Amino acid sequence: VIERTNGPKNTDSLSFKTITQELLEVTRNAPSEGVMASLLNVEKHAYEREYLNCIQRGYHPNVSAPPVTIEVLGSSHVTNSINNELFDPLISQALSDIPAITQYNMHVKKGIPVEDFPKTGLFPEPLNKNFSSNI
Amino acid sequence: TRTAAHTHIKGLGLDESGVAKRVEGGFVGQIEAREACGVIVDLIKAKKMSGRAILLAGGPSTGKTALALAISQELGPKVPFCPLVGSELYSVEVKKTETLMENFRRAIGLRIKETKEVYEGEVTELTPEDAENPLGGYGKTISHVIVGLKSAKGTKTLRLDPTIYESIQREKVSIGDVIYIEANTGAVKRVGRSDAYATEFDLETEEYVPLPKGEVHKKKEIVQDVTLHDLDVANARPQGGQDVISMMGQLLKPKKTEITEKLRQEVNKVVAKYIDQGVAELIPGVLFIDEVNMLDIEIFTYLNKALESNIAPVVVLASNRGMTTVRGTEDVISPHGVPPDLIDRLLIVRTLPYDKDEIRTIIERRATVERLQVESSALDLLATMGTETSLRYALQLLAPCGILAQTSNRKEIVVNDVNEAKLLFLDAKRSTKILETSANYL
Amino acid sequence: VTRTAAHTHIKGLGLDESGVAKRVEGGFVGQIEAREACGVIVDLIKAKKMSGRAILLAGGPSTGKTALALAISQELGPKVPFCPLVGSELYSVEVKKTETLMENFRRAIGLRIKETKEVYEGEVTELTPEDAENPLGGYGKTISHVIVGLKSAKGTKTLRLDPTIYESIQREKVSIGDVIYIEANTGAVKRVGRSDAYATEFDLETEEYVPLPKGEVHKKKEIVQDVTLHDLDVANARPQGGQDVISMMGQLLKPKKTEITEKLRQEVNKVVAKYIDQGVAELIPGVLFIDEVNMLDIEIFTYLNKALESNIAPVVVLASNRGMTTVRGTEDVISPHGVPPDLIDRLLIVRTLPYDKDEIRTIIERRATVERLQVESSALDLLATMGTETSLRYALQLLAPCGILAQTSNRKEIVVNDVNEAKLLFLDAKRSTKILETSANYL
Amino acid sequence: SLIAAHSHITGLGLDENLQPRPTSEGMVGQLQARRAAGVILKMVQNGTIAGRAVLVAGPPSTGKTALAMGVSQSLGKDVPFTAIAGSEIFSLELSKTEALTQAFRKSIGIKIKEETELIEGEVVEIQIDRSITGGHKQGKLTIKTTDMETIYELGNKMIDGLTKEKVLAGDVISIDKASGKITKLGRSFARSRDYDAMGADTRFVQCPEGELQKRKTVVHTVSLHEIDVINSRTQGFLALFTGDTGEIRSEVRDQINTKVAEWKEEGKAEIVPGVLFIDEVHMLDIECFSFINRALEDEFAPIVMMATNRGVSKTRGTNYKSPHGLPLDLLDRSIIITTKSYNEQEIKTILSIRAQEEEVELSSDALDLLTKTGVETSLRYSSNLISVAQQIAMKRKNNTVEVEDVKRAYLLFLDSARSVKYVQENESQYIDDQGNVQISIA
Amino acid sequence: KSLSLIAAHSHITGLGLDENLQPRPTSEGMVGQLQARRAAGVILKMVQNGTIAGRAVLVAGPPSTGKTALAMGVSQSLGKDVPFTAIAGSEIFSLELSKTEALTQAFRKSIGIKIKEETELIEGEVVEIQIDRSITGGHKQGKLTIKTTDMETIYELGNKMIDGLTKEKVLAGDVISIDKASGKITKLGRSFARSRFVQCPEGELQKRKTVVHTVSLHEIDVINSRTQGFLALFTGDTGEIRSEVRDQINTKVAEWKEEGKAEIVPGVLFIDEVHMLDIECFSFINRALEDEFAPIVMMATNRGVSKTRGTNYKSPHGLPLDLLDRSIIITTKSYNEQEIKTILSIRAQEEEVELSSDALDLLTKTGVETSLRYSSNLISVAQQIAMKRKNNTVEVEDVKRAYLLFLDSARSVKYVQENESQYIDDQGNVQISIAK
Numbered sequence A: 001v002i003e004r005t006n007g008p009k010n011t012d013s014l015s016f017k018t019i020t021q022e023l024l025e026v027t028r029n030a031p032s033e034g035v036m037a038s039l040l041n042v043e044k045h046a047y048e049r050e051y052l053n054c055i056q057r058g059y060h061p062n063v064s065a066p067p068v069t070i071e072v073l074g075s076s077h078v079t080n081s082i083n084n085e086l087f088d089p090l091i092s093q094a095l096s097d098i099p100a101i102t103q104y105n106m107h108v109k110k111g112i113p114v115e116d117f118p119k120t121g122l123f124p125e126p127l128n129k130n131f132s133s134n135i
Numbered sequence B: 001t002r003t004a005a006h007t008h009i010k011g012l013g014l015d016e017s018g019v020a021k022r023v024e025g026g027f028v029g030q031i032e033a034r035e036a037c038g039v040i041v042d043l044i045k046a047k048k049m050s051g052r053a054i055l056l057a058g059g060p061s062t063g064k065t066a067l068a069l070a071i072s073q074e075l076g077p078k079v080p081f082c083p084l085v086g087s088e089l090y091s092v093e094v095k096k097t098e099t100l101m102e103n104f105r106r107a108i109g110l111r112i113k114e115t116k117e118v119y120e121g122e123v124t125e126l127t128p129e130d131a132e133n134p135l136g137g138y139g140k141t142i143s144h145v146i147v148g149l150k151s152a153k154g155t156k157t158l159r160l161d162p163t164i165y166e167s168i169q170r171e172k173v174s175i176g177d178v179i180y181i182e183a184n185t186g187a188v189k190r191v192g193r194s195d196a197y198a199t200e201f202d203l204e205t206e207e208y209v210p211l212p213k214g215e216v217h218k219k220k221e222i223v224q225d226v227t228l229h230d231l232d233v234a235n236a237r238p239q240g241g242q243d244v245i246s247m248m249g250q251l252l253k254p255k256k257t258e259i260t261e262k263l264r265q266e267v268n269k270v271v272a273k274y275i276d277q278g279v280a281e282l283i284p285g286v287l288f289i290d291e292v293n294m295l296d297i298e299i300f301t302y303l304n305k306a307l308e309s310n311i312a313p314v315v316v317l318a319s320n321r322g323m324t325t326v327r328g329t330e331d332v333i334s335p336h337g338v339p340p341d342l343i344d345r346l347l348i349v350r351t352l353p354y355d356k357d358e359i360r361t362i363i364e365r366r367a368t369v370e371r372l373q374v375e376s377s378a379l380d381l382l383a384t385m386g387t388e389t390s391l392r393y394a395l396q397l398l399a400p401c402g403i404l405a406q407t408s409n410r411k412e413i414v415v416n417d418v419n420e421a422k423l424l425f426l427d428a429k430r431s432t433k434i435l436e437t438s439a440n441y442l
Numbered sequence C: 001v002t003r004t005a006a007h008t009h010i011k012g013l014g015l016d017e018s019g020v021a022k023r024v025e026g027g028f029v030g031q032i033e034a035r036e037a038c039g040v041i042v043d044l045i046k047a048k049k050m051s052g053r054a055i056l057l058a059g060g061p062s063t064g065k066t067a068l069a070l071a072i073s074q075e076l077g078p079k080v081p082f083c084p085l086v087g088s089e090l091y092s093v094e095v096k097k098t099e100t101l102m103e104n105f106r107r108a109i110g111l112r113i114k115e116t117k118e119v120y121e122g123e124v125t126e127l128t129p130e131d132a133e134n135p136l137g138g139y140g141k142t143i144s145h146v147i148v149g150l151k152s153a154k155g156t157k158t159l160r161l162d163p164t165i166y167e168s169i170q171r172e173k174v175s176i177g178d179v180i181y182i183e184a185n186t187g188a189v190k191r192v193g194r195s196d197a198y199a200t201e202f203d204l205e206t207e208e209y210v211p212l213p214k215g216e217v218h219k220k221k222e223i224v225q226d227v228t229l230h231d232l233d234v235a236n237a238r239p240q241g242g243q244d245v246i247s248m249m250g251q252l253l254k255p256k257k258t259e260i261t262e263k264l265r266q267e268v269n270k271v272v273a274k275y276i277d278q279g280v281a282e283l284i285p286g287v288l289f290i291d292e293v294n295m296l297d298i299e300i301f302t303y304l305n306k307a308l309e310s311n312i313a314p315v316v317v318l319a320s321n322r323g324m325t326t327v328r329g330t331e332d333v334i335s336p337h338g339v340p341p342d343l344i345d346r347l348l349i350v351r352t353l354p355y356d357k358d359e360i361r362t363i364i365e366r367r368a369t370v371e372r373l374q375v376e377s378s379a380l381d382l383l384a385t386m387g388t389e390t391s392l393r394y395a396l397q398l399l400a401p402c403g404i405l406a407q408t409s410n411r412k413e414i415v416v417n418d419v420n421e422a423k424l425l426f427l428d429a430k431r432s433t434k435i436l437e438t439s440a441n442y443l
Numbered sequence D: 001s002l003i004a005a006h007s008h009i010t011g012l013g014l015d016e017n018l019q020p021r022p023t024s025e026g027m028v029g030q031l032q033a034r035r036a037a038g039v040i041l042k043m044v045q046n047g048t049i050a051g052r053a054v055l056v057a058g059p060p061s062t063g064k065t066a067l068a069m070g071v072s073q074s075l076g077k078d079v080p081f082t083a084i085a086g087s088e089i090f091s092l093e094l095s096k097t098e099a100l101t102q103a104f105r106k107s108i109g110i111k112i113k114e115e116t117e118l119i120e121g122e123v124v125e126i127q128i129d130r131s132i133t134g135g136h137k138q139g140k141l142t143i144k145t146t147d148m149e150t151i152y153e154l155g156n157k158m159i160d161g162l163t164k165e166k167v168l169a170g171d172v173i174s175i176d177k178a179s180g181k182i183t184k185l186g187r188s189f190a191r192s193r194d195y196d197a198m199g200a201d202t203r204f205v206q207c208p209e210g211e212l213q214k215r216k217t218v219v220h221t222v223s224l225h226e227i228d229v230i231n232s233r234t235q236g237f238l239a240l241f242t243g244d245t246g247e248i249r250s251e252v253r254d255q256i257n258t259k260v261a262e263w264k265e266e267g268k269a270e271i272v273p274g275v276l277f278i279d280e281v282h283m284l285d286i287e288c289f290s291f292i293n294r295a296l297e298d299e300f301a302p303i304v305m306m307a308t309n310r311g312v313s314k315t316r317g318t319n320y321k322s323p324h325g326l327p328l329d330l331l332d333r334s335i336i337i338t339t340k341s342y343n344e345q346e347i348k349t350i351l352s353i354r355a356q357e358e359e360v361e362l363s364s365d366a367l368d369l370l371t372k373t374g375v376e377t378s379l380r381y382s383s384n385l386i387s388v389a390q391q392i393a394m395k396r397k398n399n400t401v402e403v404e405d406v407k408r409a410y411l412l413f414l415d416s417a418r419s420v421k422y423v424q425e426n427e428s429q430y431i432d433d434q435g436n437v438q439i440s441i442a
Numbered sequence E: 001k002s003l004s005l006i007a008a009h010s011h012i013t014g015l016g017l018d019e020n021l022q023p024r025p026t027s028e029g030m031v032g033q034l035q036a037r038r039a040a041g042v043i044l045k046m047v048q049n050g051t052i053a054g055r056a057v058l059v060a061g062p063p064s065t066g067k068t069a070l071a072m073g074v075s076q077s078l079g080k081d082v083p084f085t086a087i088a089g090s091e092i093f094s095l096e097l098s099k100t101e102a103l104t105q106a107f108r109k110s111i112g113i114k115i116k117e118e119t120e121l122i123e124g125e126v127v128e129i130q131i132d133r134s135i136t137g138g139h140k141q142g143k144l145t146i147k148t149t150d151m152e153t154i155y156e157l158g159n160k161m162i163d164g165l166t167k168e169k170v171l172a173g174d175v176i177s178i179d180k181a182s183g184k185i186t187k188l189g190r191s192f193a194r195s196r197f198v199q200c201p202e203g204e205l206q207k208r209k210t211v212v213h214t215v216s217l218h219e220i221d222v223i224n225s226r227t228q229g230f231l232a233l234f235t236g237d238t239g240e241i242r243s244e245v246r247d248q249i250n251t252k253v254a255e256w257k258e259e260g261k262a263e264i265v266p267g268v269l270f271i272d273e274v275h276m277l278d279i280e281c282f283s284f285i286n287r288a289l290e291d292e293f294a295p296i297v298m299m300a301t302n303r304g305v306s307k308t309r310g311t312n313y314k315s316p317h318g319l320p321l322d323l324l325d326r327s328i329i330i331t332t333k334s335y336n337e338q339e340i341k342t343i344l345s346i347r348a349q350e351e352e353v354e355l356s357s358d359a360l361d362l363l364t365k366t367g368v369e370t371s372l373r374y375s376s377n378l379i380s381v382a383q384q385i386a387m388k389r390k391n392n393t394v395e396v397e398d399v400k401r402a403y404l405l406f407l408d409s410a411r412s413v414k415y416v417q418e419n420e421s422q423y424i425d426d427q428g429n430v431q432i433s434i435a436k
């Protein structure tokens, strides 16, 4: 899922464009007051009509707990593998973002191109600012 | 050319402002049912009512499915038509109520029209022009982008926003490629490479779409035909998003979900808003269910609920049972396997069996469709065979007769070939007599 | 002004200091022996020593079986947990009924815990990350440390973040000029909002403004929390709350019930025992109430036979209104109250008795008083003889159409003609059955 | 929209003293049932009480669902009306108790009052600062009217709103702070230099004058079920449309009830009760009745109206017969409205109203023949014959339905009793209960 | 640990037997049932010997006659470190696992592997921590003065120990345990320094301790199956573990046993209310009882000549005859007056209830009249009725008041058969009205 790239495919093939994929594609960058975009923008219209971005939060969980720690006495390989699985840098970089001054240091000062960056910012947006935390 | 049990019928065959004639459009007999189906077709073309139900009943091999397909051909290809079997509603992913509602929403169509203002063709130049006073701490501040386009019998230089150059860089637009820019959104897309830049390298992967015809700038009016179920499954599923859930669900099995009534209400109100604007036309269609005795009483109850809706299309039901218990009930005796609550809500069209001359004419038309040549005495013996056993048995015994005629290096079916096909292939009655008169687990 | 729905005229059992119930006090009329038995049961629950005791409220329809359980719940108060349930809730299409019964058993045992919190809070003054030596090495993140400057009242601190903390710092989208709240137990960060030291009206994102927090940046505070054992079970079954990968992906997936193993429950029991042994936690046994217990089948009853013999299970109250009814899931056996005899031998049965005419009259009088209506005495006597004629519930539910029909004629009192009109408009079960029997086409 | 079965019923047709007129708002006859429905409507409108069960019972084709539709039309907007059928409870994803709990909780509205700020001004300057990857976006917006000049700071969502349907420094837009809406009113600057793309042929509009920022109290209604679905998990707003809300836990509902009580105490939100209407309630298991018997006693419960057309029949899930197909526990705590069959004058008035609704002009003799057939057969058959007779009339090119059109529609389309007679006369042609059929006509 | 309020079998601490497996009249909370207790002691010696496997024992008798009490006594006298899996008959009808798979998991939860290992630890009291840090955090230097009540030492610390001491912040005055191989540092608490609280450790700082692990076969089956992790041991979604990894575990366990690296302990699988199983469960048990890695299965039931579930015929004890051929049967008997009185006295001493003698005679009379469990349930209600009138000893009228308030089975059946017109029958007919 993480390193999925939209590579090109040749025309001489049996996989063609199903109609609902075409309806999904024509509304990717379409603006407002277009007929296909307005027929395809039901959920954001319901979001903006029902004033949902200023609503409060009524539920919080009672207990929050980390996963169960597995310990093996007398081995560092198990600790290294557990720390690799819990804090996988590819996934943890995918669920977050690089700071802007750091990105400026990579691209301009270090010569790294844009496409050579690790994929970031895949975390889904919360509904409100109030829904982003349990506190 | 493939023929399969049908396609010898081309509409009902009525004349205008009148009744059905005796033989027309591949139909022999059945005048009154054809007239009733024509009245139903005119009612559907009137495009006013909603949720009207027609049950056509009769014996086996009578022409109920042929009449439904004749209705579908008489309406045309732009009006939606959803064929269905009563056994298809039992799914192990979602409840049968949701499947019935999906098949209800599949039968209503929306015709939309739109205007597109495009600029397409091969790029001649691509120059991001710098500004007069660049800002400090930056690099190559752009005031506009000059793009020149070339197509068949027309070249034109453009003057663009500073913003689109980012999309040009992201879409990897070099010189010599063919691009496509719509007006209001920008959003340049790379449709391919020109064919004049094909043979400078021995090996490449990129395709070569040729130069597009017409001018570089033309406004085109397009017309698109969708259904309401397509809009429902497009609004219910998310669009192309950057979240991990959207990309994870796109690579997983597309499991069907219970679409809520809220999404349907929002879809109907935005569709009504754009219909009142004068852009969209609503085309109700036909939902056809064959062998409706397979439904149980829960689906019958939800049919009673859903036929009183505001948007529901014309439903055509077919059945061949008589006094039968409704499925899901142990002691309710009902005509055609349909409970009286649904029976009170529909109109019943009765279909009648045939006689010998109509059987002979039907066999003649099915022979002349399958590109076969039959002798007259063999035709009369086949008509007698159809009278004695079945119409469908006489119809299905034509291609073995043609093959056995071809095996003897002749092009005409004779009496000996139909006797050989009689002796080789059995019917239901003689097979039942064989089963009854044998005691070796036959 | 207020809303009433079939109850809430009942406040408690209404007993003396010696447990002797009065004739009418606390919304109850009659039922002295059942109320005394329920008071004994309430005292037994408050004794907090017994585990796995079971009573069964046996009686007819419309005799006050649910009202006694609600009175028990209000007698115990909101401090003790009380789990109401219907017999049809145990059949789920996600998990088996045995696991649902175990879940509802564990949902009725509470715990009160005094918990310490290490907090870093204040206004962010500076936020400077420093970069790694090689960022595209594949192993290791892009940055190494982030320096944050927190300013509070009478204090200003500077902290060096772990990048794992910085991910949860960045995910709530904090910036310079923002009041934050970092909980050192789990690493969760709350963004309070913009500080009011700067300007206010120049924003466009409907934010709220908060002053600087009092006290130092680093704090240790004591929060008293109330919890159940089922909350700990579902927290450890689906781990969310950590800053690692699995707990982060657990918040985005669809929640689903699972068969929580016994080993997890024993580990949770050992941790809770360690907590109460330290003098931190306090255990509160509670009540699980199941209404319409005849809907349970033989498998749930057979698992209840095992589950009542545990050393954790709370006091369970049941209710039924069947005389000699065959048990569901079986084919021939007939047992009292729809409850099999091997479970009946472990119960304590409390009988509930029907009422007389005067009890029906004063129940109707209290219901009319609670619903804020004025009823004439002749209309009250007609309602009482109607309630004795047909049902108590029919006489209770006809009071509000009487009130509407009295309001629509510009009157406050309810009169005899109003009761006759409400009789003519609305029917009961007996008259409807008499219409059904002499009917043309299944009317 | 389309003409439905109950499209002619707008209200209940009652006076101020709750006395029903003989012909008002598309409803004729049924005086006592309409009076009782008006009493139920007033009880719902007061909102003081909760959890009252009302049963509507009668023979088929009497006006149960018509009465429910009249109640729903007279209920007005901002009061929820959840109308479901009995077979919708059984699902493969939710339990029966969970589906009934969601149906109960969909019928209670929370009216929430919010404060918002409206900004209407001419756009002067837009500065947007983005990161290299386009993730972190911030910026400034200098907006003006004829009297003041304000520089605002922008968030991520506001810049996302500005980037869609692009504003170009000289337009007139509208800003809602609480909703986050971007609405381009038009363009006032009328710039000469315009890039070939883009193009704001937005209608001309004057620059707004007066105060830039205005305060407004707005109000909006949500349901309790939407609050539980939103607070259930991370992406509950998608589950509101996809219906993927599987078995919400009880702790969520307890916390939502406590927070709703807190919002009532603080004066922010109020509670509006609604009506839950179960059509064909007899298609429910005994466990559903057992759950309803305890769910009707809660504070957050709506007024439940159930409809049954059944007499004494077997309760589903058990093996004994009960009045109306319902157990005596649910029949104890309900008040029953009884509907009665019609006369010829009421049937004639109903057919006149239905002919006026379908815009079909009828002759007097055709109306008398339709009244006679609706007296002999059911009312729904003679109601359905009107559109067929209109189509037959339009086939002969006269826009007035005469007698012979109704006679031809009677001959073409059959009843229930006539179809039963034709099946019983020719039982060998149809498949019976034992699967035996005689296909051959020899 | 192991919090528990009061259970129904909490007064039983084991089987009361001598060295010749003879039952005492009253020992370890168990009275009566001499032959059944002797047979269960022989079964306990079978389990403790461990040289035989796959033996099925059926405990059958009347209800409320010491069956689950016998199982609890066997489980208590087994002690700790020996697996004991007590399940019910209705617990295997799952929605994500088949019945045979759930039975296989319940079978393999009762066989354990004993592995002894040695590890070295540094458990001590921190005197002083000195940290030298640079500006950029490149090189860190560390001194650690740490001690016991017996020694005292100073350690130079490397960079990773500096990082592991900064994380989970250790101050002076703390008592900590350090593992050198894995780098796990645990704060045991604070020492006795008034200036929680634990005692400063004694002896050598670097100790070497041997720990013994008992791992069930089901845990290794979950771990070795690569499709799911160890969290399925806690979350419960193991999900139809295949037989190939079971074959690999069965080979590797014998490979470890031959090399002497591990040992085999067998356990007891107890199935309470075994008559609720299906016929396909019995057909699986008939072949699963003949494995080498099979525990001893004890089944408890009280049915007599009932219908076997999944079939249409009747069988003794609800079990088919092929299963009953593979079992030996222990039979219980009903209790006398004296044993009922002794059981009620033991339950009186258990719940801290002070009883008069005449109240005990009344309880014994109403116990031999109605039930044992009814008198065992009245004894705590009568204490609350006693405490309502402010006296400690439960008297006769205190038992009589609880007898009046709370009914039993026979009186409820009598009152229901007297006033059956007010209840719902099988046909669903009730009368709610009082008049007419």
Ligand SMILES: Nc1ncnc2c1ncn2[C@@H]1O[C@H](COP(=O)(O)OP(=O)(O)O)[C@@H](O)[C@H]1O
Residues within 6 Å of the ligand: B005, B006, B026, B027, B028, B029, B030, B059, B060, B061, B062, B063, B064, B065, B066, B067, B362, B392
């Ligand atoms: N009036 C007709 N004219 C020509 N062919 C007919 C006619 N009626 C039926 N058939 C033929 O009979 C065959 C079977 O009839 P079918 O429509 O399947 O009847 P049913 O649907 O009642 O079983 C079809 O292949 C069709 O071509």
Ligand SMILES: Nc1ncnc2c1ncn2[C@@H]1O[C@H](COP(=O)(O)OP(=O)(O)O)[C@@H](O)[C@H]1O
Residues within 6 Å of the ligand: C006, C007, C027, C028, C029, C030, C031, C060, C061, C062, C063, C064, C065, C066, C067, C068, C363
């Ligand atoms: N002693 C009483 N005093 C006042 N109201 C009562 C009393 N007993 C019963 N009721 C009322 O009778 C109704 C039926 O009682 P409930 O226990 O809910 O159902 P059931 O008795 O059928 O189990 C309740 O609404 C309750 O308010």
Ligand SMILES: Nc1ncnc2c1ncn2[C@@H]1O[C@H](COP(=O)(O)OP(=O)(O)O)[C@@H](O)[C@H]1O
Residues within 6 Å of the ligand: D005, D006, D009, D026, D027, D028, D029, D030, D058, D059, D060, D061, D062, D063, D064, D065, D066, D067, D307, D309, D350, D379
């Ligand atoms: N008073 C009335 N006003 C308008 N239409 C009516 C009236 N009474 C009956 N009808 C018609 O008769 C039918 C009644 O059936 P329905 O509404 O399903 O309720 P029920 O099944 O209880 O008779 C409806 O289609 C309605 O159009």
Ligand SMILES: Nc1ncnc2c1ncn2[C@@H]1O[C@H](COP(=O)(O)OP(=O)(O)O)[C@@H](O)[C@H]1O
Residues within 6 Å of the ligand: E008, E009, E029, E030, E031, E032, E033, E062, E063, E064, E065, E066, E067, E068, E069, E070, E302, E343, E372, E373
């Ligand atoms: N020999 C005994 N010693 C002590 N208590 C006993 C003895 N036999 C039975 N009991 C008590 O009798 C009750 C019923 O025992 P149990 O075996 O659980 O019932 P069942 O035989 O129905 O399984 C238990 O609570 C137990 O405490």
